[PDB]
């Protein structure tokens, strides 16, 4: 599923990402935007054997566990395929844990490079919250 900006923004508010641990909804839409371009089926295999899954490109070495990643910590207690769902619940549930892990949203490169210290609220702008 390829979400649309406003749609996903609403879905994320739907799931409590609106102002979660200091992060305004804008940050999450922007992070999704650059991490997967709102594509929930987005997967990025790494040379290191792991793979990033879903709308927020969660990594299979630390958060989810596919069936092909030695040492996977699987901290989000979910098969990575659940991050490829049209329903963002699993990704969000994981993202909240990840953003609480101590590095903030800096846990996502894409977010750091294209959203950090930027007018993020612009991504929820023009939407029906």
């Amino acid at each position, epitope marked *: 599923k390829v979400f649309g900006r406003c749609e996903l923004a609403a879905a994320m508010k739907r799931h*409590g990402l609106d102002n979660y*641990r200091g992060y305004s909804l804008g940050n999450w839409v922007c992070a999704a935007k650059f991490e997967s371009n709102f594509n929930t089926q987005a997967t990025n295999r790494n040379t290191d054997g792991s793979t990033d899954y879903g709308i927020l490109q969660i990594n299979s070495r630390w958060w989810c566990n596919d069936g092909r990643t030695p040492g996977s910590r699987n901290l989000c207690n979910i098969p990575c395929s659940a991050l490829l769902s049209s329903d963002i619940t699993a990704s969000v549930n994981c993202a909240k844990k990840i953003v*609480s892990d101590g590095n903030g949203m800096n846990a996502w490169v894409a977010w750091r490079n294209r959203c950090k210290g930027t007018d993020v609220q612009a991504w929820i702008r023009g939407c029906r919250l």
Partner: antibody, heavy 113, light 107 residues
Framework: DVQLQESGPSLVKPSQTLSLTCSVT????????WSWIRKFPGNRLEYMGY???????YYNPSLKSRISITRDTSKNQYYLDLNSVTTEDTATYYC???????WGQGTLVTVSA | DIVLTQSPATLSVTPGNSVSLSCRAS??????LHWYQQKSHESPRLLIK???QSISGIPSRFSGSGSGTDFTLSINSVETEDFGMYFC?????????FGGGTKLEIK
């Protein structure tokens, strides 16, 4: 399978550090975030703070530098070091993983005169 | 600091009757609300995660609902051992906070 065992002096004196230990069984402390929660008389619970699975710690601003959560990655247990407590700090201290799934039995550590 | 006001403070009931517990946030917290059961001489137990998500092992008669600022825990056909404290907790903003608690007891 998973068990959170709390131990430590259930009675400390004014001005000195309140220290508690939470032994974790069936689950390595680096594979989960862990916290300390205390219940004050009158069912007043307080989230003291926590250590992430990656070592980042978070402390409830209510404590103010008085709190230090550290962990023993070898014996697989973590601690609570609360400086200069007072009658106020008297409560039952709990340790549970971040997700809320596991908890320690709960140990009441009072601080009377 | 997000405040959680639970009501009623106490709630008496006869096993078999159904109850509805309330938890209101002094600020919209999305769905970052969690429910705990607290029996005397015992430690909090996670009943409902994120407003309504069920916890493997918790009896079906338990269920949560709500969003934003108002949340509800529903216990249908309360049983003799469902009696105890009930606390809600927001994980939305740091420092995480707990509700004042609703004491469920026999009529």
């Amino acid at each position: 399978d998973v068990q959170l065992q709390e131990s430590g002096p259930s009675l400390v004196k004014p001005s000195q550090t309140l220290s508690l230990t939470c032994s974790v069984t069936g689950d390595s402390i680096t594979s989960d975030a862990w916290s300390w929660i205390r219940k004050f008389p009158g069912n007043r619970l307080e989230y003291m703070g926590y250590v992430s699975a990656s070592g980042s710690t978070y402390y409830n601003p209510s404590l103010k530098s008085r709190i230090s959560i550290t962990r023993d990655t070898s014996k697989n247990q973590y601690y609570l070091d609360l400086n200069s407590v007072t009658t106020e700090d008297t409560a039952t201290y709990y340790c549970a993983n971040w997700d809320g799934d596991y908890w320690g039995q709960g140990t009441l550590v009072t601080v009377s005169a | 600091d997000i405040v959680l006001t639970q009501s009623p403070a106490t709630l008496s009931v006869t096993p078999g009757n159904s109850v509805s517990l309330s938890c209101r946030a002094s600020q919209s917290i999305g769905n970052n609300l969690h429910w705990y059961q607290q029996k005397s001489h015992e430690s909090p137990r996670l009943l409902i995660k994120y407003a309504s998500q069920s916890i493997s092992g918790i009896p079906s008669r338990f269920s949560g609902s709500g969003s934003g600022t108002d949340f509800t825990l529903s216990i249908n056909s309360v049983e003799t051992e469902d009696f105890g404290m009930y606390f809600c907790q927001q994980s939305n903003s740091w420092p995480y906070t707990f509700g004042g608690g609703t004491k469920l007891e026999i009529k």
